[PDB]
Short mmCIF file of all heavy atoms in Angstrom, two decimals:
data_model
loop_
_atom_site.label_atom_id
_atom_site.label_comp_id
_atom_site.label_asym_id
_atom_site.label_seq_id
_atom_site.Cartn_x
_atom_site.Cartn_y
_atom_site.Cartn_z
N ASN A 238 78.73 -56.35 38.73
CA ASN A 238 78.66 -54.94 38.34
C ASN A 238 77.23 -54.51 38.05
O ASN A 238 76.90 -53.33 38.19
CB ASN A 238 79.57 -54.67 37.13
CG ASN A 238 81.05 -54.58 37.52
OD1 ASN A 238 81.53 -53.48 37.80
ND2 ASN A 238 81.76 -55.73 37.56
N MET A 239 76.37 -55.46 37.67
CA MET A 239 74.97 -55.07 37.41
C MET A 239 74.18 -54.95 38.69
O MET A 239 73.25 -54.11 38.78
CB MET A 239 74.31 -56.10 36.50
CG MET A 239 72.84 -55.72 36.19
SD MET A 239 72.21 -56.71 34.85
CE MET A 239 72.13 -58.31 35.56
N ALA A 240 74.49 -55.76 39.70
CA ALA A 240 73.70 -55.81 40.93
C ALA A 240 74.64 -55.80 42.15
O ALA A 240 74.61 -56.72 42.96
CB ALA A 240 72.81 -57.05 40.96
N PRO A 241 75.44 -54.74 42.31
CA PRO A 241 76.37 -54.72 43.44
C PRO A 241 75.68 -54.61 44.78
O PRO A 241 76.29 -54.90 45.80
CB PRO A 241 77.24 -53.48 43.16
CG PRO A 241 76.34 -52.58 42.35
CD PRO A 241 75.54 -53.52 41.49
N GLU A 242 74.41 -54.22 44.78
CA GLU A 242 73.67 -54.16 46.04
C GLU A 242 73.42 -55.55 46.61
O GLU A 242 73.09 -55.65 47.80
CB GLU A 242 72.36 -53.43 45.83
CG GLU A 242 71.35 -54.18 44.96
CD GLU A 242 71.57 -53.95 43.46
OE1 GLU A 242 72.57 -53.29 43.08
OE2 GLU A 242 70.72 -54.45 42.70
N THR A 243 73.55 -56.60 45.80
CA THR A 243 73.41 -57.95 46.34
C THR A 243 74.70 -58.44 47.00
O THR A 243 74.68 -59.50 47.63
CB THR A 243 72.98 -58.94 45.25
OG1 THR A 243 74.02 -59.07 44.28
CG2 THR A 243 71.72 -58.45 44.54
N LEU A 244 75.79 -57.68 46.86
CA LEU A 244 77.04 -57.98 47.52
C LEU A 244 77.01 -57.47 48.95
O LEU A 244 76.23 -56.58 49.30
CB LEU A 244 78.20 -57.31 46.78
CG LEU A 244 78.46 -57.71 45.31
CD1 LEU A 244 79.36 -56.70 44.64
CD2 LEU A 244 79.10 -59.08 45.26
N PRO A 245 77.86 -58.01 49.82
CA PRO A 245 77.99 -57.45 51.17
C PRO A 245 78.64 -56.07 51.09
O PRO A 245 79.40 -55.77 50.15
CB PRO A 245 78.87 -58.47 51.90
CG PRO A 245 79.57 -59.22 50.84
CD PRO A 245 78.64 -59.25 49.68
N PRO A 246 78.36 -55.22 52.08
CA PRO A 246 79.00 -53.89 52.07
C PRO A 246 80.52 -54.01 52.17
O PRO A 246 81.04 -54.81 52.95
CB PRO A 246 78.41 -53.19 53.31
CG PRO A 246 77.19 -53.99 53.65
CD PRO A 246 77.50 -55.40 53.24
N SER A 247 81.22 -53.23 51.35
CA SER A 247 82.68 -53.32 51.29
C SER A 247 83.20 -52.19 50.44
O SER A 247 82.44 -51.53 49.71
CB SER A 247 83.11 -54.66 50.70
OG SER A 247 82.76 -54.73 49.32
N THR A 248 84.50 -51.96 50.50
CA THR A 248 85.12 -50.99 49.60
C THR A 248 85.03 -51.44 48.15
O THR A 248 85.04 -50.60 47.24
CB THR A 248 86.59 -50.74 49.97
OG1 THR A 248 87.32 -51.97 49.98
CG2 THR A 248 86.70 -50.09 51.34
N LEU A 249 84.94 -52.76 47.91
CA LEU A 249 84.80 -53.24 46.54
C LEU A 249 83.43 -52.89 45.97
O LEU A 249 83.33 -52.48 44.80
CB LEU A 249 85.05 -54.74 46.50
CG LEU A 249 84.84 -55.40 45.13
CD1 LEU A 249 85.76 -54.79 44.09
CD2 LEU A 249 85.02 -56.92 45.23
N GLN A 250 82.39 -53.04 46.78
CA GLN A 250 81.05 -52.60 46.36
C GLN A 250 81.04 -51.10 46.10
O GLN A 250 80.47 -50.63 45.10
CB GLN A 250 80.04 -53.00 47.45
CG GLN A 250 78.63 -52.50 47.20
CD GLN A 250 77.73 -52.79 48.38
OE1 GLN A 250 77.94 -52.24 49.47
NE2 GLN A 250 76.75 -53.68 48.19
N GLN A 251 81.69 -50.31 46.97
CA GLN A 251 81.82 -48.88 46.71
C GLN A 251 82.59 -48.61 45.43
O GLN A 251 82.25 -47.67 44.69
CB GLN A 251 82.52 -48.17 47.86
CG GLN A 251 81.75 -48.14 49.18
CD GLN A 251 82.61 -47.55 50.29
OE1 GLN A 251 83.21 -48.29 51.07
NE2 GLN A 251 82.69 -46.24 50.34
N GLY A 252 83.64 -49.39 45.17
CA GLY A 252 84.46 -49.17 43.99
C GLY A 252 83.70 -49.48 42.72
O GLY A 252 83.89 -48.80 41.70
N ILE A 253 82.85 -50.49 42.75
CA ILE A 253 81.95 -50.76 41.62
C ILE A 253 81.10 -49.52 41.32
O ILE A 253 80.94 -49.14 40.16
CB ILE A 253 81.09 -52.00 41.91
CG1 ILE A 253 81.98 -53.25 41.81
CG2 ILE A 253 79.95 -52.13 40.90
CD1 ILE A 253 81.24 -54.53 42.32
N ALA A 254 80.57 -48.89 42.37
CA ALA A 254 79.77 -47.70 42.17
C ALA A 254 80.59 -46.56 41.59
O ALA A 254 80.12 -45.82 40.70
CB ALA A 254 79.12 -47.27 43.48
N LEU A 255 81.84 -46.40 42.06
CA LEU A 255 82.67 -45.32 41.53
C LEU A 255 83.01 -45.56 40.07
O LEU A 255 83.09 -44.59 39.29
CB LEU A 255 83.93 -45.15 42.36
CG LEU A 255 83.66 -44.63 43.77
CD1 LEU A 255 84.94 -44.66 44.61
CD2 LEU A 255 83.10 -43.18 43.71
N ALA A 256 83.15 -46.82 39.67
CA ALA A 256 83.55 -47.08 38.30
C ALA A 256 82.41 -46.90 37.30
O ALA A 256 82.66 -46.73 36.11
CB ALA A 256 84.14 -48.50 38.15
N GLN A 257 81.16 -46.97 37.76
CA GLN A 257 80.00 -46.69 36.93
C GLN A 257 79.48 -45.28 37.16
O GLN A 257 78.38 -44.94 36.68
CB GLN A 257 78.88 -47.70 37.19
CG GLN A 257 79.04 -48.94 36.36
CD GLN A 257 78.01 -49.99 36.73
OE1 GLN A 257 76.82 -49.82 36.49
NE2 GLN A 257 78.47 -51.06 37.37
N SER A 258 80.21 -44.45 37.90
CA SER A 258 79.85 -43.06 37.97
C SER A 258 80.22 -42.36 36.65
O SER A 258 81.06 -42.84 35.88
CB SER A 258 80.50 -42.39 39.16
OG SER A 258 80.07 -43.05 40.36
N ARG A 259 79.53 -41.26 36.37
CA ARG A 259 79.73 -40.52 35.12
C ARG A 259 80.65 -39.33 35.36
O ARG A 259 80.31 -38.42 36.12
CB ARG A 259 78.38 -40.07 34.56
CG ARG A 259 77.59 -41.24 33.99
CD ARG A 259 76.31 -41.52 34.78
NE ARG A 259 75.48 -42.51 34.07
CZ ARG A 259 74.61 -42.20 33.11
NH1 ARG A 259 74.39 -40.92 32.80
NH2 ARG A 259 73.93 -43.15 32.50
N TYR A 260 81.81 -39.33 34.68
CA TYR A 260 82.81 -38.27 34.84
C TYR A 260 82.86 -37.31 33.68
O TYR A 260 83.21 -36.12 33.88
CB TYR A 260 84.20 -38.89 35.04
CG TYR A 260 84.26 -39.76 36.27
CD1 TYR A 260 83.88 -41.11 36.22
CD2 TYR A 260 84.61 -39.21 37.50
CE1 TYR A 260 83.89 -41.91 37.38
CE2 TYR A 260 84.59 -40.00 38.65
CZ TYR A 260 84.26 -41.34 38.59
OH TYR A 260 84.26 -42.10 39.73
N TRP A 261 82.54 -37.77 32.47
CA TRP A 261 82.58 -36.93 31.27
C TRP A 261 81.52 -37.43 30.32
O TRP A 261 81.14 -38.59 30.36
CB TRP A 261 83.95 -36.98 30.57
CG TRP A 261 85.14 -36.81 31.47
CD1 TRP A 261 85.92 -37.81 32.04
CD2 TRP A 261 85.74 -35.56 31.86
NE1 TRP A 261 86.94 -37.24 32.75
CE2 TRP A 261 86.86 -35.87 32.66
CE3 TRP A 261 85.44 -34.23 31.60
CZ2 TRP A 261 87.66 -34.89 33.22
CZ3 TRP A 261 86.23 -33.25 32.15
CH2 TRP A 261 87.35 -33.59 32.95
N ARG A 262 81.11 -36.57 29.40
CA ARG A 262 80.17 -36.92 28.34
C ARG A 262 80.77 -36.55 26.99
O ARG A 262 81.32 -35.46 26.83
CB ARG A 262 78.82 -36.19 28.51
CG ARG A 262 77.78 -36.61 27.50
CD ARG A 262 76.51 -35.80 27.64
NE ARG A 262 76.73 -34.37 27.42
CZ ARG A 262 76.74 -33.79 26.22
NH1 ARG A 262 76.56 -34.51 25.12
NH2 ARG A 262 76.95 -32.47 26.10
N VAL A 263 80.73 -37.49 26.04
CA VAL A 263 81.02 -37.22 24.63
C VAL A 263 79.81 -37.70 23.86
O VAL A 263 79.59 -38.92 23.74
CB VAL A 263 82.28 -37.93 24.13
CG1 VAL A 263 82.51 -37.57 22.64
CG2 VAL A 263 83.48 -37.56 24.97
N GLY A 264 79.04 -36.76 23.32
CA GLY A 264 77.81 -37.10 22.61
C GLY A 264 76.87 -37.81 23.58
O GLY A 264 76.50 -37.25 24.62
N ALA A 265 76.53 -39.04 23.25
CA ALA A 265 75.63 -39.81 24.10
C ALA A 265 76.36 -40.78 25.01
O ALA A 265 75.71 -41.51 25.77
CB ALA A 265 74.58 -40.58 23.25
N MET A 266 77.69 -40.81 24.99
CA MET A 266 78.45 -41.75 25.78
C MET A 266 79.03 -41.05 26.99
O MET A 266 79.56 -39.94 26.89
CB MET A 266 79.55 -42.39 24.93
CG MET A 266 80.71 -42.92 25.71
SD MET A 266 81.94 -41.63 25.95
CE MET A 266 83.28 -42.66 26.52
N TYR A 267 78.93 -41.69 28.16
CA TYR A 267 79.46 -41.19 29.41
C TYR A 267 80.63 -42.05 29.82
O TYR A 267 80.55 -43.28 29.74
CB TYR A 267 78.44 -41.18 30.53
CG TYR A 267 77.39 -40.08 30.41
CD1 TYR A 267 76.18 -40.30 29.75
CD2 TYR A 267 77.58 -38.84 31.00
CE1 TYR A 267 75.23 -39.31 29.63
CE2 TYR A 267 76.64 -37.83 30.89
CZ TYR A 267 75.46 -38.09 30.21
OH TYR A 267 74.52 -37.11 30.11
N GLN A 268 81.72 -41.41 30.26
CA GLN A 268 82.92 -42.12 30.62
C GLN A 268 82.91 -42.42 32.12
O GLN A 268 82.83 -41.51 32.93
CB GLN A 268 84.15 -41.26 30.28
CG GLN A 268 85.48 -42.03 30.57
CD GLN A 268 85.62 -43.26 29.70
OE1 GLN A 268 85.53 -43.18 28.47
NE2 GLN A 268 85.80 -44.42 30.34
N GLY A 269 82.99 -43.70 32.47
CA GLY A 269 83.21 -44.15 33.84
C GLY A 269 84.69 -44.46 34.06
O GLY A 269 85.54 -43.99 33.31
N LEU A 270 84.97 -45.29 35.07
CA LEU A 270 86.35 -45.79 35.27
C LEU A 270 86.39 -47.14 34.57
O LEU A 270 85.86 -48.13 35.09
CB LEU A 270 86.71 -45.92 36.75
CG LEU A 270 86.49 -44.65 37.62
CD1 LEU A 270 86.91 -44.92 39.06
CD2 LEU A 270 87.22 -43.41 37.04
N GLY A 271 86.95 -47.17 33.35
CA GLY A 271 86.92 -48.39 32.56
C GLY A 271 85.59 -48.58 31.84
O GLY A 271 85.53 -48.53 30.61
N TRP A 272 84.51 -48.78 32.62
CA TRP A 272 83.17 -48.85 32.03
C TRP A 272 82.80 -47.57 31.26
O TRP A 272 83.21 -46.45 31.62
CB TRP A 272 82.12 -49.06 33.12
CG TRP A 272 82.20 -50.43 33.78
CD1 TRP A 272 82.55 -50.69 35.08
CD2 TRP A 272 81.91 -51.69 33.18
NE1 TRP A 272 82.50 -52.05 35.33
CE2 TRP A 272 82.11 -52.70 34.17
CE3 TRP A 272 81.48 -52.10 31.90
CZ2 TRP A 272 81.91 -54.06 33.94
CZ3 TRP A 272 81.27 -53.46 31.66
CH2 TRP A 272 81.50 -54.43 32.67
N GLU A 273 81.98 -47.75 30.23
CA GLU A 273 81.32 -46.67 29.49
C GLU A 273 79.81 -46.88 29.54
O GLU A 273 79.30 -48.01 29.59
CB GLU A 273 81.82 -46.62 28.04
CG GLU A 273 83.35 -46.41 27.99
CD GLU A 273 83.96 -46.65 26.64
OE1 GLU A 273 83.19 -46.73 25.68
OE2 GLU A 273 85.24 -46.77 26.54
N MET A 274 79.07 -45.78 29.51
CA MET A 274 77.63 -45.84 29.78
C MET A 274 76.88 -44.94 28.80
O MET A 274 77.37 -43.87 28.41
CB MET A 274 77.28 -45.38 31.21
CG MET A 274 77.72 -46.34 32.33
SD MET A 274 79.47 -46.16 32.80
CE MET A 274 79.59 -44.46 33.36
N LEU A 275 75.65 -45.35 28.45
CA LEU A 275 74.71 -44.47 27.75
C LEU A 275 73.41 -44.52 28.52
O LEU A 275 73.08 -45.56 29.10
CB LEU A 275 74.47 -44.94 26.28
CG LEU A 275 75.76 -45.04 25.41
CD1 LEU A 275 76.35 -46.45 25.51
CD2 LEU A 275 75.38 -44.70 23.95
N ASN A 276 72.70 -43.40 28.56
CA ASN A 276 71.38 -43.39 29.19
C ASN A 276 70.45 -44.37 28.49
O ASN A 276 70.39 -44.41 27.26
CB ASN A 276 70.76 -42.00 29.16
CG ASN A 276 71.48 -41.01 30.05
OD1 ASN A 276 72.28 -41.40 30.90
ND2 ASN A 276 71.18 -39.74 29.88
N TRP A 277 69.71 -45.14 29.27
CA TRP A 277 68.71 -46.07 28.80
C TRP A 277 67.33 -45.50 28.99
O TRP A 277 67.03 -44.93 30.05
CB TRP A 277 68.83 -47.41 29.56
CG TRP A 277 67.85 -48.45 29.06
CD1 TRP A 277 66.62 -48.74 29.58
CD2 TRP A 277 68.02 -49.30 27.93
NE1 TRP A 277 66.01 -49.72 28.82
CE2 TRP A 277 66.85 -50.08 27.80
CE3 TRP A 277 69.04 -49.47 26.99
CZ2 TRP A 277 66.67 -51.00 26.79
CZ3 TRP A 277 68.84 -50.39 25.96
CH2 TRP A 277 67.67 -51.15 25.87
N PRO A 278 66.43 -45.63 28.02
CA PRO A 278 66.53 -46.40 26.77
C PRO A 278 67.33 -45.66 25.69
O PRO A 278 67.31 -44.43 25.63
CB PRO A 278 65.07 -46.57 26.35
CG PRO A 278 64.40 -45.32 26.83
CD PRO A 278 65.07 -45.07 28.19
N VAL A 279 68.01 -46.45 24.88
CA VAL A 279 68.88 -45.99 23.81
C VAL A 279 68.71 -46.93 22.61
O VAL A 279 68.56 -48.13 22.80
CB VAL A 279 70.35 -45.91 24.31
CG1 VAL A 279 70.85 -47.27 24.73
CG2 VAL A 279 71.25 -45.29 23.27
N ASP A 280 68.71 -46.37 21.42
CA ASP A 280 68.66 -47.15 20.18
C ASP A 280 70.02 -47.75 19.86
O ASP A 280 71.07 -47.23 20.25
CB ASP A 280 68.25 -46.25 19.02
CG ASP A 280 68.12 -47.02 17.71
OD1 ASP A 280 67.12 -47.77 17.56
OD2 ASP A 280 68.99 -46.88 16.81
N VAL A 281 70.00 -48.89 19.12
CA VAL A 281 71.26 -49.58 18.84
C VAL A 281 72.20 -48.70 18.04
O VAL A 281 73.43 -48.74 18.24
CB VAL A 281 70.98 -50.92 18.12
CG1 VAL A 281 70.35 -50.72 16.75
CG2 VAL A 281 72.28 -51.75 17.99
N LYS A 282 71.68 -47.89 17.11
CA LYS A 282 72.58 -47.07 16.31
C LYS A 282 73.31 -46.08 17.18
O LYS A 282 74.49 -45.81 16.95
CB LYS A 282 71.80 -46.34 15.21
CG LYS A 282 71.25 -47.30 14.16
N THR A 283 72.63 -45.53 18.20
CA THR A 283 73.31 -44.62 19.13
C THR A 283 74.40 -45.34 19.92
O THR A 283 75.48 -44.77 20.13
CB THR A 283 72.28 -44.00 20.08
OG1 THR A 283 71.28 -43.29 19.33
CG2 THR A 283 72.98 -43.04 21.04
N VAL A 284 74.17 -46.59 20.32
CA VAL A 284 75.21 -47.30 21.05
C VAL A 284 76.40 -47.56 20.13
O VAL A 284 77.55 -47.40 20.55
CB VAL A 284 74.68 -48.63 21.64
CG1 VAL A 284 75.78 -49.36 22.39
CG2 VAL A 284 73.52 -48.38 22.54
#
């Protein structure tokens, strides 16, 4: 999930990208598919 570009091209590689896409924001947290994300750099208290 950190380096899907090192994988061969596939729907699974595409799906990794879709799951780390940003669909909603609550404060500093962005909702993916399962995964959650914050813009980096971020302080620990914000995480």
Side-chain angles (χ1 to χ4, degrees), residues 238-281 283-284:
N238 282 269
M239 180 167 69
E242 68 276 5
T243 67
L244 299 164
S247 68
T248 56
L249 176 59
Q250 175 187 66
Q251 293 174 263
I253 287 170
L255 292 172
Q257 274 175 68
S258 301
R259 288 114 171 274
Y260 299 87
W261 312 96
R262 185 184 61 84
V263 180
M266 156 272 193
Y267 285 92
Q268 184 63 54
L270 307 181
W272 292 112
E273 301 167 13
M274 290 82 60
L275 304 90
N276 291 346
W277 182 265
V279 61
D280 183 74
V281 64
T283 301
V284 180

